[PDB]
Amino acid sequence: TLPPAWQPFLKDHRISTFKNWPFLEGCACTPERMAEAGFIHCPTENEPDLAQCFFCFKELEGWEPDDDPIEEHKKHSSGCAFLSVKKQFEELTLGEFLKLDRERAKNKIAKETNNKKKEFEETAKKVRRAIEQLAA
């Protein structure tokens, strides 16, 4: 009985996000192994195999059956502190846990601001093109 905001730290919650994941028994990137590696399933119509690290918010698609999710996490977001977590969730101290949640909140903010930077730059491109067209 833990607060919705903290659920994603629990492996079993993460596993449960995998609704209609295509890579099941026989494959290396199963729901069990995705969840063990930190991922939750964030499918869209567009990007049906989309997964995101609940901790560093890195988003990966194009999963192949032989993909080892942990190796993929390491390659694509090596700075992620969840990767350093050796202990089981319940073996953490509250102090350790709270340290981790603070880093997660900082990662969230950083991500949101990276997204805003990308949107701003995209709007700037549209404005630029339209001015160029008008000058001609």
């Binding site: 997964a51 990966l60 993909d67």
Partner: peptide, 6 residues
């Protein structure tokens, strides 16, 4: 797998 883009 790969980073997702727009």
């Amino acid at each position: 797998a790969r980073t997702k883009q727009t």
